[PDB]
Design an enzyme around this catalytic site. Structure first.
Site, short mmCIF file in Angstrom:
data_model
loop_
_atom_site.label_atom_id
_atom_site.label_comp_id
_atom_site.label_asym_id
_atom_site.label_seq_id
_atom_site.Cartn_x
_atom_site.Cartn_y
_atom_site.Cartn_z
N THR C 1 55.92 43.02 53.77
CA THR C 1 56.29 43.20 52.34
C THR C 1 55.49 42.27 51.45
O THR C 1 55.32 41.10 51.76
CB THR C 1 57.80 42.94 52.12
OG1 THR C 1 58.56 44.06 52.57
CG2 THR C 1 58.09 42.69 50.65
N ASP C 17 54.67 46.54 47.12
CA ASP C 17 54.29 47.61 48.02
C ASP C 17 55.52 48.45 48.36
O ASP C 17 56.65 48.08 48.05
CB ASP C 17 53.65 47.03 49.29
CG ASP C 17 54.68 46.52 50.28
OD1 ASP C 17 55.45 45.60 49.93
OD2 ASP C 17 54.72 47.04 51.41
N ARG C 19 56.24 49.88 51.61
CA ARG C 19 56.44 50.05 53.04
C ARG C 19 57.65 49.25 53.51
O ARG C 19 57.86 48.11 53.08
CB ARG C 19 55.21 49.60 53.84
CG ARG C 19 55.38 49.69 55.36
CD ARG C 19 54.21 49.08 56.10
NE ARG C 19 53.03 49.92 56.02
CZ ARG C 19 51.90 49.69 56.68
NH1 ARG C 19 51.77 48.64 57.47
NH2 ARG C 19 50.88 50.53 56.54
N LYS C 33 61.15 48.66 46.07
CA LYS C 33 61.53 47.26 46.19
C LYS C 33 61.79 46.58 44.85
O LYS C 33 62.23 45.43 44.84
CB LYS C 33 60.46 46.49 46.97
CG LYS C 33 60.29 46.98 48.40
CD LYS C 33 59.09 46.36 49.07
CE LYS C 33 58.69 47.15 50.31
NZ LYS C 33 57.81 46.35 51.21
N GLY C 47 62.42 40.07 52.23
CA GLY C 47 63.41 39.63 53.19
C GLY C 47 64.28 40.76 53.70
O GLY C 47 63.84 41.91 53.74
N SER C 129 55.90 38.88 53.38
CA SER C 129 54.96 38.54 54.44
C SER C 129 53.52 38.58 53.94
O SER C 129 52.64 37.94 54.53
CB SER C 129 55.13 39.49 55.62
OG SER C 129 54.88 40.84 55.24
N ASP C 166 48.01 42.37 55.26
CA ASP C 166 49.24 42.05 55.95
C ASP C 166 49.78 43.32 56.61
O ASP C 166 49.94 44.34 55.94
CB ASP C 166 50.28 41.46 54.99
CG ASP C 166 51.67 41.39 55.59
OD1 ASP C 166 51.81 40.91 56.73
OD2 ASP C 166 52.63 41.81 54.91
N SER C 169 52.92 44.98 55.05
CA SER C 169 52.84 45.62 53.74
C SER C 169 51.94 46.84 53.84
O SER C 169 51.00 46.88 54.64
CB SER C 169 52.29 44.66 52.68
OG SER C 169 52.97 43.42 52.70
#
Ligand SMILES: O=C(NC1CCCC1)[C@@H]1CCCCOc2cccc(c2)C[C@H](N2CCCC2=O)C(=O)N[C@@H](CCN2CCOCC2)C(=O)N1
Lengths: 201, 216, 222, 212, 237, 241, 235, 202, 232
Positions: C1, C17, C19, C33, C47, C129, C166, C169
């Site tokens: 994320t 993002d 995902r 999100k 989280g 992340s 990442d 994400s």
């Protein structure tokens, strides 16, 4: 500890050794492992001495209260059920008790095994304690429902004697009781040194 | 208190003819770090009672607060009754034992000195509720380094004068400075006599380092 | 994320993002999100997804009650205070990391809120992340008092850095532009990734699957 | 954090025909250090009953205070002092009340029963207890008990006239066994406090032991 | 009337009638006297027999080695208060390893018995107490009332017809400090006898005594143990 | 007429009669006076002695509620002792929470609110006592407050509670206490207490004196015995002439 | 009526509810206890109300413990809680102290419940009113035979001979006329039955009375119909 | 983190670095660790950010209410006592070292340390946080009585600069605040304004 | 103190809960309120006369939004109404938190009526002295409800509450028509208020709210001014 009990034609025989230990140290040789709950009802003690003593004393209190409330002695089955329900509340907390409840009630002789692990079972013969396997051997080979009273006394004495011979944590004196229809009687208390003399020539 | 944070080292105490003397260095250590170098670890409880503490300093401050409030509350009544050193020692024993029994101990060892009714009192209370009385006391490393000297002297001379006891505690504090890695050469001496409780402030011991030249 | 936010000349830009993964497998390709708190306040969440959803829903409802009673637009500081005090009450066991952004009577405000209840008031923030890559983009390119289009491009580049560097994400970039005079919820704002074209046909024709039993239950319609 | 520490202490009790002796060493230790040399482990409970407690000193102190309080409450509610047997039974219940966070204390009660005969009750930490003619407890109990078995119980001895234990012989035996214990148990030493319970009351005696 | 049923209702005169009625409860009880010298505190209680075949009701109770009490009024309330006092003394000995000073015990009693006088549905304690104690300040006689007020007295008498005893005590109090124990008890007995009617007389059955002092734990004398104190008593007027 | 049975009931005129009845209880008590001077506060109480059987000092109406705060009471003594316990708890809790001596004004406010809480409900009855709190500190000066059963708290230069409050106030108003010391004020307090005392109705009485000021270093205490003897001699001499 | 709380004092210093409960005692069937050196004898009129009722179901004398019995008078249903408390008390005492509770201690423990009633500041399980029963506890402890009387007010007293219930006035006067400290248990039993026969309305027979004794030797013993017949024959 | 406070005649000087890390990642590089608790009372926070934020907010609330009730400016000692009570009561759950520095009319400028565990001590100067370990010697060598406000500001800046150079958990800018009767003067030293000490070469 | 545990509302020998009837008398003495359900919305109007010009008429509102789509008005006691408004907003938010959907008007009315019923049986309280008109829009449909002090609720096409509400109901019967649009409903509501109004009506004398697809909203004084100018 080795305690045994068995029903036969003339009632119930209850026998125990008298040794108590703390670790490997012999704390006592004169412990009374047969609790007299009432003149018709006996309890035996195996495992934690404090646990067995305390909870069987609580049982004796509750049995007396039951008799006062109901104008009749509690039955053996009810007494053992009371004990089992009491100890079930502390399951897994470290209580160590193996008890035989032996009596004579309206249904005749009664013999129940109750332990802190939760078991409660009726039976014709039981043995409890670290020396119970040794006692089982001898009692099983000698037991019949139609033993004479003196033969039954001898069987119990010899079974406890052999158990004290093999088991490091059993010894002292064989204490022997007879539950009959009109209440129990303390039969005898024979030191296993004397028995060793008697059973060996 | 599961983990003591800022702690005080040994506290010494000695009975003498007509009073009691207690000594404590003025240091609060944060592990090995000598973090707070001017803290008092001795408290006047009342005119006849004084208290020195080793161990966690925040626990000591809490105990000082509670004891001070108790003494104030009693003095408010004005009924002619005051807590004796023995009563304070018993109360502290009970408080420590109760906290230990809850697995939430006060991480302190306490020396209670007092003088009431022409008799000296010297009591010890540790964090588990172990308490007792003795002619001389030393907490922490003092128990290994000071107590033998105190007890040798008292075994050969059961009753000391105030001057003798003062010299004795000074010698013990010097030994603690030499050999206790959490010690500090700045300490207080509290004395309780019939006159009351007097806390004498920053003192130091003279040290000798001649053996440093005795290196080969 | 990867979630991010910046303060620009006249407001806030938030970005995320889209995902959502379980372990190392993509569960949702189009996860939203950026969460509504109030008409002038939004919150991106990283989280634990359930924790983020529930915490933001609860604070949004409490702020709605507060605004109904006061009859005034809510303040970002109020949202931050409620969130942080709740999270501290739960001692970090609510795994909600949040980027809270809004415009109230006192201007634009951007907070980062951490699971244990600590907060930071900053002109730009990143979380998730992929937070480090987005933060690298910000440190390299952020300037104070950017215009709206510059801020949109910057936040988009930050989220793209997270998406492409990442593994946690991916997918789309969603933006939320908040100013005193408007709110633009741009979902999706950019679609950098797309499933490739299916070369073959694997169409299961009728009768391909063997059936043991069948039961047709007619449904009564109005 | 451990809520327990072993502070040593050796206690002994001997029941006679019309007396009971309760004896203890007065050393209070911790780890390998000596807290004090003047901490007797015997406590008078009633004109007829003494108790010896050894083990974790904090528990010893608390337990003795609790027993004193219970004795006073019994006297208030029943208008008579507790007998030795009643005290033993009550103590068993008090110890079992902490069955899951025990008092780390070994207790021996020495007193006179209602007939005026010496009675000794021995306890384990969780309350198991029994009546004995003699008992040792605490640090050196394994050292003391066999000698008492041999000399008071005449165990393993043939052609010995089993004779009642006189007070003088009992005192000599108590002193001798504690002297032997001070030689071998590091915790035992510095002094021997002896409490003699008779119908006349409780008499106290102190004897020196080695200090190393 | 409308003001005389609850403890929480002030009357227009500024009185609380329920408390006064509890005072009456005390005034009905059998007389008891307390007095003291420089070294001793004495309680003497006249005990009633409900029937000629019944034992006389105990009027003196133990609280602690240094404290005893004499009760007048509802005996169940007396037992409640005595149990509370005993527990307080036990707590003091447990925590501080010292006897609870008498005045502090009396203050605690005051707080405990004042609480119910202000709460709806509660009633005052219907007992008055004479408290004899000895502590570091010497001997003490205290009087506690259903109103939760307490008094520190050179001497006191409470219960039915206790005014006569109070008259005697007022007359003779000058002599109490320099009295030995026997003279002190005799003064107490004469004061108590003043409460008796002409037909009645003090005997070894209806008299109980309680004594506490410096070297004397609180001791209760009943039945023949009272004869030594009654032996020297003269004949009443 | 039914409106005066509970503190949770207003009369049709907006009065709470149970509070007024509690105040009457206060009014039927022996008088106490507090006087604030430049250096501190002096309290005097006319403790009526209802029998010679009582030890001197029985039923004291002056209390120490904190090292620096004294309290004088009139009315139901048991209620007054309860309020003194409340005040002591408040002072101790304040020291525990904030780490310094409770200011007298704050303590008075807290105790007054505790008193007020008992004027709102049928479950409890109003306190039957009025009391004064006196304190002296270097930073705050001398402070004297009075609280009554309704929970009203006010600061005073001179205050009288009890059955002779009006005559005592008339006497207090004759003093220029703002430019006097505690040493003269103790004599004046003794004189006023002796003046307002009713020799016929009230029989005998003990004079209770306490003070807190610079001469006590901010500690509230009973007036020393020699000082009180001098003050009582002065009061009797003033009465006789 | 509800014009007053249950904890209201009268102008004469008595709790209204306790006085009313004593009035309730004065409606119970008559019981009589006599204490002698050889033991305690309790007796109680059963008061059979219909010949269809079974007299054996009327329990007016109950065993508290092997050495303690209790006779009761008044609202008998209220007595059940007190009897159970006494029984549990004696068994708790035996469990804790390995000894028998004294009669005075049992009586004290029961009497401690008398005034434990009230409405406000009372948790559920609280009694709303006093017990309307009077009890005679007879027993034998180390101090010999003991007879105790407890009434609804919580006051308990040791008695040599006591009558409770409706006819307690005449019964008490007769007991005073006949009691001496040296009388034997047989004498006490005969005297109690004579007094009961006198104060009862129905003819005294073996079915309409209850008689128990406690002796230092024997435990609490309830007389059977044949023992009752033998005692009644000599009257 | 490195926090510092120093008393001077008439006031106090507080200082802090601005670095907040999670592991070795710098989550915030311009943190503000000097928190106003009241008009002339500040706290410097070190330890867990969540804990010190929550405790400082609670103390701010309690102290504001107390000051309103008493109608008087709060004492620095009172704020320190509130902090101490919270930090001691929850010492098992909190990780918070606090320095409470301020001015009040009764005792002038005051500095109190409330380190982890909840003890409270007044000091002429206090240091705290992970970086303070590296400057103990420096402060012990450089501190002197009678320093003016300007000298105290320079002293704090130097000490914090050294700590920041050595402590990986410290850095960023230096935030300073001088508190006196006249009020609070805040400033930020950044870049070349931060005192520099040359790294030894060769 | 703790509250009384016994009910202050009990049955009379005739079978009436007289405290409920007395609370209804309080309601009938309140300021007039009107609700009209139009084809495409609902209008709530209420007289808002201040005692004097000193009152800042725009500081306290009688027409309150419960949710974006639910508003309400009352007749009776204002403080009780504030209590019920707070409860209704809380209940709506709880519903939204569980179901993630704006609470239906009927469900909100049922929950609020449940609270009002609770205050007719619980110990030591009196009933609320208010009647509520709740307007809402959901499922592409307008809803008008009335909730009484007893906790009983009814669905209305049009209704009047407060002083002179019987005449208002007769007037609404004569004028009302199911087919009329929202603006005609607003005109009819203002006319209904005019019937029982004392003195001249201004945009500051009355309060108006409207619920439709967009949501519930209190009308502004300028909009009410336009509607009043049109009404004349
Ligand atoms: O023989 C025994 N049972 C027979 C005898 C009766 C019935 C059968 C047991 C055998 C040991 C196993 C029981 O596990 C425990 C459970 C709970 C508590 C303790 C032990 C406490 C303690 N523990 C705990 C572990 C180390 C130690 O030492 C301990 O063992 N106590 C002795 C007390 C017996 N005597 C002392 C008192 O005086 C009378 C007799 C004890 O329980 N023995």
């Amino acid at each position: 500890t080795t305690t045994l009990a068995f029903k036969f034609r003339h009632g119930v025989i209850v026998a125990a050794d008298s040794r108590a230990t703390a670790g490997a140290y012999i704390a006592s040789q004169t412990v009374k492992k047969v609790i007299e709950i009432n003149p018709y009802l006996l309890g035996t003690m195996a495992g934690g001495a404090a646990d067995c003593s305390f909870w069987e004393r609580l049982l004796a209190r509750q049995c007396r209260i039951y008799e006062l409330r109901n104008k009749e002695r509690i039955s053996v089955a009810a007494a053992s059920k009371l004990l089992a329900n009491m100890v079930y509340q502390y399951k897994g907390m470290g209580l160590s008790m193996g008890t035989m409840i032996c009596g004579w009630d309206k249904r005749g002789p009664g013999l129940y095994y109750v332990d802190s692990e939760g078991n409660r079972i009726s039976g014709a013969t039981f043995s409890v304690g670290s020396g119970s396997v040794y006692a089982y051997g001898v009692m099983d080979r000698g037991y019949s429902y139609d033993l004479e009273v003196e033969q039954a006394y001898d069987l119990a004495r010899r079974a406890i004697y052999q158990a004290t011979y093999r088991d490091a944590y059993s010894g002292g004196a064989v204490n022997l009781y007879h539950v009959r229809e009109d209440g129990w009687i303390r039969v005898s208390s024979d030191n296993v040194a004397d028995l060793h003399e008697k059973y060996s020539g | 208190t599961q983990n003591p944070m800022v702690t005080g080292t040994s506290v010494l105490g000695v009975k003498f003819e007509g009073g009691v003397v207690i000594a404590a260095d003025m240091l609060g250590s944060y592990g090995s770090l000598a973090r707070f170098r001017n803290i008092s670890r001795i408290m006047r409880v009342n005119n006849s009672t004084m208290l020195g503490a080793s161990g966690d300093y925040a626990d000591f401050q809490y105990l000082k607060q509670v004891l001070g409030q108790m003494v104030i509350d009693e003095e408010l009544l004005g009924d002619g009754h005051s807590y004796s050193p023995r009563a304070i020692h018993s109360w502290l024993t009970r408080a420590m034992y109760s906290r230990r029994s809850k697995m939430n101990p006060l991480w302190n060892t306490m020396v209670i000195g007092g003088y009431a009714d022409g008799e000296s009192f010297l009591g010890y209370v540790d964090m588990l509720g172990v308490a007792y009385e003795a002619p001389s006391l030393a907490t922490g490393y003092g128990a290994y380094l000071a107590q033998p000297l105190l007890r040798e002297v008292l075994e050969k001379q059961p009753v000391l004068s105030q001057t003798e006891a003062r010299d004795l505690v000074e010698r013990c504090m010097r030994v603690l400075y030499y050999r206790d890695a959490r010690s500090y050469n700045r300490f207080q001496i509290a004395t309780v006599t019939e006159k009351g409780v007097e806390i004498e402030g920053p003192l130091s011991t003279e040290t000798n380092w001649d053996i440093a030249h005795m290196i080969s | 994320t990867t979630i991010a936010g910046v303060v620009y000349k006249d407001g806030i830009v938030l970005g995320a993002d889209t995902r959502a993964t379980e372990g190392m497998v993509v569960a949702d390709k189009n996860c939203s999100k950026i969460h509504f708190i109030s008409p002038n306040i939004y919150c991106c969440g990283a989280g634990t997804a359930a924790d983020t959803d529930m915490t933001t829903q609860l604070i949004s409802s409490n702020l709605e009650l507060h605004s109904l009673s006061t009859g005034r637009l809510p303040r970002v500081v109020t949202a931050n205070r409620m969130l942080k005090q709740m999270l501290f009450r739960y001692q970090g066991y609510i795994g909600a990391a949040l980027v809270l952004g809004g415009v109230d009577v006192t201007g634009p405000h951007l907070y980062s809120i951490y699971p244990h209840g600590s907060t930071d008031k900053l002109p730009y923030v990143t979380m998730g992340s992929g937070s480090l890559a987005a933060m690298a983009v910000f440190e390299d390119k952020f300037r104070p008092d950017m215009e709206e289009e510059e801020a949109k491009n910057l936040v988009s580049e930050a989220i793209a850095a997270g998406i492409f560097n990442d593994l946690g994400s991916g997918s789309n970039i969603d933006l939320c532009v908040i100013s005193k005079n408007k709110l633009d919820f741009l979902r999706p704002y950019t679609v950098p990734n797309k499933k490739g074209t299916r070369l073959g046909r694997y169409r299961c024709e009728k009768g391909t699957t063997a059936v043991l039993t069948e039961k047709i239950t007619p449904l009564e319609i109005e | 954090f451990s809520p327990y520490v072993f502070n040593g202490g050796t206690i002994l009790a001997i029941a006679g025909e019309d007396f009971a002796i309760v004896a203890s060493d007065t050393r209070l230790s911790e780890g390998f250090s000596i807290h004090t040399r003047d901490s007797p482990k015997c406590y008078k409970l009633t004109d007829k009953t003494v108790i010896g407690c050894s083990g974790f000193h904090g528990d010893c102190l608390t337990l003795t205070k609790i027993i004193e309080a219970r004795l006073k409450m019994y006297k208030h509610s029943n208008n008579k002092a507790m007998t030795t047997g009643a005290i033993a039974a009550m103590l068993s219940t008090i110890l079992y009340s902490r069955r899951f966070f025990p008092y780390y204390v070994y207790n021996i009660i020495g007193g006179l029963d209602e007939e005026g005969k010496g009675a000794v009750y021995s306890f384990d930490p969780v309350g198991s207890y029994q009546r004995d003619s003699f008992k040792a407890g605490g640090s050196a109990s394994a050292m003391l008990q066999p000698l008492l078995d041999n000399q008071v119980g005449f165990k393993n001895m043939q052609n010995v006239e089993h004779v009642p234990l006189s007070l003088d012989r009992a005192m000599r035996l108590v002193k001798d066994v504690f002297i032997s214990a001070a030689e071998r148990d590091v915790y035992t030493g510095d002094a021997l406090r002896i409490c003699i319970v008779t119908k006349e009351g409780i008499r106290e005696e102190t004897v020196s032991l080695r200090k190393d | 009337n409308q003001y005389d049923n609850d403890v929480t209702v002030w009357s227009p005169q500024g009185r609380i009638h329920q408390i006064e009625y509890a005072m009456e409860a005390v005034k009905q009880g059998s007389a008891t006297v307390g007095l003291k010298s420089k070294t001793h505190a004495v309680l003497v209680a006249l005990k009633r027999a409900q029937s000629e075949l019944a034992a006389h009701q105990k009027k003196i109770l133990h609280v602690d080695n240094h404290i005893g009490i004499s009760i007048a009024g509802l005996t169940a309330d007396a037992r409640l208060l005595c149990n509370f006092m005993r527990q307080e003394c036990l707590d003091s000995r447990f925590v501080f390893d010292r006897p609870l000073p008498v005045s502090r015990l009396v203050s605690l009693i005051g707080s405990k018995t004042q609480i119910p006088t202000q709460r709806y549905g509660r009633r005052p304690y219907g007992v008055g107490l004479l408290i004899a104690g000895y502590d570091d300040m010497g001997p003490h006689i205290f009087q506690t009332c259903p109103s939760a007020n307490y008094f520190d007295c050179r001497a006191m008498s409470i219960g039915a017809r206790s005014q006569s005893a109070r008259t005697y005590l007022e007359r003779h109090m000058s002599e109490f400090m320099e009295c030995n124990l026997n003279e002190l008890v005799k003064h107490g007995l004469r004061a108590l006898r003043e409460t008796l009617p002409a037909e009645q007389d003090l005997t070894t059955k209806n008299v109980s005594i309680g004594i506490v002092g410096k070297d004397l734990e609180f001791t209760i004398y009943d039945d023949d143990d009272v004869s030594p104190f009654l032996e020297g008593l003269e004949e009443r007027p | 007429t039914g409106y005066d049975l509970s503190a949770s009931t207003f009369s049709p005129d907006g009065r709470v009669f149970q509070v007024e009845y509690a105040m009457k209880a206060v009014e039927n008590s022996s008088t106490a006076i507090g006087i604030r001077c430049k250096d501190g506060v002096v309290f005097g109480v006319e403790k009526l002695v209802l029998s010679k059987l009582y030890e001197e000092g029985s039923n004291k109406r002056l209390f120490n509620v904190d090292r620096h705060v004294g309290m004088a009471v009139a009315g139901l003594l048991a209620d007054a002792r309860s309020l003194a316990d409340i005040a002591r708890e408040e002072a101790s809790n304040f020291r525990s929470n904030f780490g310094y001596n409770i200011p007298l004004k704050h303590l008075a406010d807290r105790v007054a609110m505790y008193v007020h809480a008992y004027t709102l409900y049928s479950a409890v009855r109003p306190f039957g006592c009025s009391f004064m709190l006196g304190s002296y500190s270097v930073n705050d000066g001398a402070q004297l407050y009075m609280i009554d059963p309704s929970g009203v708290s006010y600061g005073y230069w001179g205050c009288a509670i009890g059955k002779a409050r009006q005559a005592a106030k008339t006497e207090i108003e004759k003093l220029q206490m703002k430019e006097m010391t505690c040493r003269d004020i103790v004599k004046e307090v003794a004189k006023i207490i002796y003046i307002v005392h009713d020799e016929v109705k009230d029989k005998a009485f003990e004079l209770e004196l306490s003070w807190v000021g610079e001469l006590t270093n901010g500690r509230h205490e009973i007036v020393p015995k020699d000082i009180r003897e001098e003050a009582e001699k002065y009061a009797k001499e003033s009465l006789k002439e | 009526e509800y014009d007053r709380g249950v904890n209201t004092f009268s102008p004469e210093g008595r709790l209204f509810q306790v006085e009313y409960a004593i009035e309730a005692i004065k409606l119970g069937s008559t019981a009589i206890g006599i204490q002698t050196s050889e033991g305690v004898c309790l007796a109680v009129e059963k008061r059979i109300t219909s010949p269809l009722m079974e007299p054996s179901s009327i329990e007016k004398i109950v065993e508290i413990d092997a050495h303690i019995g209790c006779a009761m008078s008044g609202l008998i249903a209220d007595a059940k809680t007190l009897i159970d408390k006494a029984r549990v008390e004696t068994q708790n005492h035996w469990f804790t102290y390995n000894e028998t509770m004294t009669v005075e201690s049992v009586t004290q423990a029961v009497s401690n419940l008398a005034l434990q009633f009230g409405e406000e500041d009372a948790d559920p399980g609280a009694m709303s009113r006093p017990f309307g029963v009077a009890l005679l506890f007879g027993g034998v402890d180390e101090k010999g035979p003991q007879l105790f009387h407890m009434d609804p007010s919580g006051t308990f007293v040791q008695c040599d001979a006591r009558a409770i219930g409706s006819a307690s006035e005449g019964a008490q006067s007769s007991l005073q006329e006949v009691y001496h400290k040296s009388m034997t248990l047989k004498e006490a039993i005969k005297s109690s039955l004579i007094i009961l026969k006198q104060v009862m309305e129905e003819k005294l027979n073996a079915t309409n009375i209850e008689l128990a004794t406690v002796q230092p030797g024997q435990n609490f013993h309830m007389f059977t119909k044949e023992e009752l017949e033998e005692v009644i024959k000599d009257i | 983190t490195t926090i510092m406070a120093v008393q001077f005649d008439g006031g106090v000087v507080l200082g802090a670095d601005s670095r907040t890390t999670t592991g070795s990642y710098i989550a915030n590089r311009v943190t503000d660790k000097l928190t106003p608790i009241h008009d002339r009372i500040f706290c410097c926070r070190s330890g867990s950010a969540a804990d010190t934020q929550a405790v400082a907010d609670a103390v701010t609330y309690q102290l504001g209410f107390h000051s309103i009730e008493l109608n008087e400016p709060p004492l620095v000692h009172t704020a320190a006592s509130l902090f101490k009570e919270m930090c001691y009561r929850y010492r098992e759950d909190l990780m918070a070292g606090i320095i409470i520095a301020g001015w009040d009319p009764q005792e002038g400028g005051q500095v109190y340390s409330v380190p982890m565990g909840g003890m409270m001590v007044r000091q002429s100067f206090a240091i705290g946080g992970s970086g303070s370990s590296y400057i103990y010697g420096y402060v012990d060598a450089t501190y002197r009585e009678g320093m003016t406000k300007e000298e105290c500001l320079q002293f704090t800046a130097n000490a914090l600069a050294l700590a920041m150079e050595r402590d990986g958990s410290s850095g960023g800018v230096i935030r300073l605040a001088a508190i006196a009767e006249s009020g609070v003067e805040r400033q930020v030293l950044l870049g070349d304004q931060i005192p520099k000490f040359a790294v030894a070469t060769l | 103190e703790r509250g009384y545990s016994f009910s202050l509302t009990t049955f009379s020998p005739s079978g009436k809960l007289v405290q409920i009837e007395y609370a209804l008398a309080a309601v009938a003495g309140g300021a007039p309120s009107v609700g009209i359900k139009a084809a495409n919305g609902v209008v709530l109007a209420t007289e808002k006369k201040q005692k004097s010009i000193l009152y800042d008429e725009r500081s306290v509102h009688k027409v309150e939004p419960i949710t974006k789509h639910i508003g309400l008005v009352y007749s009776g006691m204002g403080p009780d109404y504030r209590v019920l408004v707070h409860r209704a907003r809380k209940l709506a938010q709880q519903y939204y938190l569980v179901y993630q959907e704006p609470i239906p008007t009927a469900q909100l009315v049922q929950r609020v009526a449940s609270v009002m019923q609770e205050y007719t049986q619980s110990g030591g309280v009196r009933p609320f002295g208010v009647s509520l008109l709740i307007c809402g829009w959901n499922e592409g449909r307008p809803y008008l409800f009335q909730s009484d002090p007893s906790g009983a609720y009814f669905a209305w096409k049009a209704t009047a509450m407060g002083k002179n509400y019987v005449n208002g109901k007769t007037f609404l019967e004569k004028r009302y028509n199911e087919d009329l649009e929202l603006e005609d409903a607003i005109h009819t509501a203002i006319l209904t208020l005019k019937e029982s109004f004392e003195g001249q009506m201004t945009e500051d004398n009355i309060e108006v709210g409207i619920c439709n697809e967009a949501g519930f909203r209190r009308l502004t004084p300028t909009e009410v001014k336009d509607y009043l100018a049109a009404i004349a």
